[PDB]
Amino acid sequence: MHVFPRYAAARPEQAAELVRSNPFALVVSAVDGVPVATHAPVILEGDAVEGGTLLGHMARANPHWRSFASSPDVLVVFSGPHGYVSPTVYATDPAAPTWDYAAVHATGRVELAEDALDVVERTVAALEAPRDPAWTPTPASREYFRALLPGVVAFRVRVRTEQSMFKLSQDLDAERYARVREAFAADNPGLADLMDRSL
Amino acid sequence: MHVFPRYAAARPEQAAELVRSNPFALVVSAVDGVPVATHAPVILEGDAVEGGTLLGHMARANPHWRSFASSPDVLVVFSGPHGYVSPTVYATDPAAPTWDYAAVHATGRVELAEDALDVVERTVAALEAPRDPAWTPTPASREYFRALLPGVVAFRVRVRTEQSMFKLSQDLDAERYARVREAFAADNPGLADLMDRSL
Numbered sequence: 001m002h003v004f005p006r007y008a009a010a011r012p013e014q015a016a017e018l019v020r021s022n023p024f025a026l027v028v029s030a031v032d033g034v035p036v037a038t039h040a041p042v043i044l045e046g047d048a049v050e051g052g053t054l055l056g057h058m059a060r061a062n063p064h065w066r067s068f069a070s071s072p073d074v075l076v077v078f079s080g081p082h083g084y085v086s087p088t089v090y091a092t093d094p095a096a097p098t099w100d101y102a103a104v105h106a107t108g109r110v111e112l113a114e115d116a117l118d119v120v121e122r123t124v125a126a127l128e129a130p131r132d133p134a135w136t137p138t139p140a141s142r143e144y145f146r147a148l149l150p151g152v153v154a155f156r157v158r159v160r161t162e163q164s165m166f167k168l169s170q171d172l173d174a175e176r177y178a179r180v181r182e183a184f185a186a187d188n189p190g191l192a193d194l195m196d197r198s199l
Numbered sequence: 200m201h202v203f204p205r206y207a208a209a210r211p212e213q214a215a216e217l218v219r220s221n222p223f224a225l226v227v228s229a230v231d232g233v234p235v236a237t238h239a240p241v242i243l244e245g246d247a248v249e250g251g252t253l254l255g256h257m258a259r260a261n262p263h264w265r266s267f268a269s270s271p272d273v274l275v276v277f278s279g280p281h282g283y284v285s286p287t288v289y290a291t292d293p294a295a296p297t298w299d300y301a302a303v304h305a306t307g308r309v310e311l312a313e314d315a316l317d318v319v320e321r322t323v324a325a326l327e328a329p330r331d332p333a334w335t336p337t338p339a340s341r342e343y344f345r346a347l348l349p350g351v352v353a354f355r356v357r358v359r360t361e362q363s364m365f366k367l368s369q370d371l372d373a374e375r376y377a378r379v380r381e382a383f384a385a386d387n388p389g390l391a392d393l394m395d396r397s398l
């Protein structure tokens with residue numbers, strides 16, 4: 001990821017906001033010299049991505065985690081709303097398409113987490129608490145969780161560096177920008193809500 | 200990515216289908232020993248992901264491509280529909296949440312593509328052709344494209360290995376599965392359309 005100045009985060013709290021709202025992340029490591037990636041839920045501990053702690057889990061049957069033992073640097077990609085921008089929307093005669101999106105990339109040293117129960121319980125609360133209705137583990141779910149523990153591996157990442165991208169057509173003139181926003185308001189309201197949060 | 204047997208592709212053409220329908224991919228390489236990822240449009244050449252050719256582009260100002268010169272192995276992640284599965288939907292007393300999703304991971308040797316114009320023109324056709332209405336570069340767009348060439352770097356990947364995941368609650372019993380599907384039909388019809396394509 002290269003962040004063009006025009007597409008940088010406007011306020012530094014928008015990164016944590018994206019990360020909290022889009023926990024189904026991509027966890028990436030360099031198994032040998034080749035990237036390997038797992039789709040896993042990853043939550044944030046603290047106010048800032050930068051310098052905070054990420055917590056996640058994956059299947060013990062997924063051999064990816066066996067590569068975390070040496071504590072290599074890992075990259076975690078959080079992806080927010082995204083949408084293709086067609087020149088059909090622009091209605092100008094010379095144009096070129098693009099893709100609008102928001103993402104946060106966090107890099108740091110990974111570590112296997114011994115308290116897998118904490119991790120998965122915190123992840124539940126993270127996903128269920130904003131929902132309506134929210135789900136709270138009944139006491140038998142808590143015992144069920146314990147029975148699932150042998151099959152899960154939890155990990156943590158101390159974020160060394162963080163990069164945020166908010167590529168939301170801000171480089172567009174007034175008229176073309178309005179067209180882009182109103183099409184996403186119809187088609188993709190999460191993306192349109194972010195182009196308001198960018199003004 | 201580890202693909203649990205129960206979540207494997209049912210027909211081997213579902214991978215190419217996902218890749219064609221979700222071209223906004225994540226291109227991942229091991230800059231030094233650390234993963235670096237760029238969100239870029241990537242299209243498929245041929246009938247099969249496995250053994251086919253991926254084509255993509257990114258900004259010349261994005262230094263990521265400078266790492267492709269040695270032709271390292273790269274990983275390209277295509278992400279289809281996905282959705283959180285809350286135990287609230289299950290309405291059973293012991294349960295644990297999960298995330299349903301479809302993805303294709305393709306690994307191979309990357310190469311800088313000298314015909315960037317072909318690549319970007321093929322990508323336009325890929326994105327616009329299924330749309331309604333489709334956009335066809337006017338002749339002045341084709342000249343505009345040429346003026347943009349200095350700012351773009353195109354690349355290609357010959358797919359050495361491919362992995363597909365269709366994690367779509369197939370391990371669910373009859374009753375719980377129905378509840379999961381009808382909630383996504385309301386909330387997430389792309390995901391629900393895939394759980395039909397899995398039966």
Ligand code: HEM
Binds near residue numbers: 058121146
């Ligand atoms: C809070 C929301 C949760 C979500 C979104 C979620 C999601 C997931 C996902 C996507 C995987 C696959 C990882 C991979 O491919 O390696 C997985 C694996 C697993 N998780 Fe979670 N999980 C949640 C909570 C929990 C809880 C509370 C437990 C309790 C211990 C748990 C235990 C497990 C187990 C045992 C597996 C492996 C299953 C298998 O072998 O197929 N998860 N989970």
Ligand code: HEM
Binds near residue numbers: 239322
């Ligand atoms: C077909 C649909 C297309 C999509 C979805 C698309 C999308 C994108 C994206 C997401 C980037 C950012 C890459 C990065 O972060 O490094 C980019 C960069 C770029 N692409 Fe495309 N593109 C398309 C077609 C084209 C065409 C036809 C051209 C003509 C040459 C072109 C030229 C460029 C240029 C010049 C840049 C760099 C812009 C900058 O420096 O900010 N693209 N494109």
